[PDB]
Chain A
Amino acid sequence: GGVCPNLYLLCRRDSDCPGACICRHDSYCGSGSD
């Protein structure tokens, strides 16, 4: 369930996107697992 409301943003690192989410190089923030 790890999603954030503004997960649709280009991020450079995990700390580059709000909420408890991680950042992928493919410009996706979040980890939908759990």
Chain B
Amino acid sequence: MYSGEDCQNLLKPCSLCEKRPRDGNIIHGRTGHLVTCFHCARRLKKAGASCPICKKEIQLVIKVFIA
């Protein structure tokens, strides 16, 4: 229910899957980047990769939904 066109770059679904929304956000410290789905974000650090944007270490991931 987003309403801001500048944000359209952030509002994209999971870029790896595009089968599900971007419900995988990566927290590093006090900020986090919304970049993939929850499943991909978990798999990403398992592969040894850090945040794809800022490469700051992934402390945790959260599962967002409207439920």
Contact A8 B32 (CB under 8 A): no
Whether A8 and B62, one on each chain, are in contact in the complex, defined by CB atoms closer than 8 angstroms, is yes
State the CA gap A27–B65 with chains docked (Å).
10
Number of A-B contacts (CB under 8 A): 32
Given the known A-B contacts A27-B25, A28-B25, are A8 and B31 also in contact in the complex, defined by CB atoms under 8 Å?
A: no
Residues of chain B contacted by A8 (CB below 8 angstroms): 62-65
Minimal Cβ-Cβ distance residue in B for A26: B32
| Contact indicator A26/B63 (Cβ below 8 Å) | no
Q: Which residues of B contact A (CB under 8 A)?
A: 25-27, 30-34, 62-66
- Contacts from A to B (Cβ < 8 Å): 8-10, 24-28
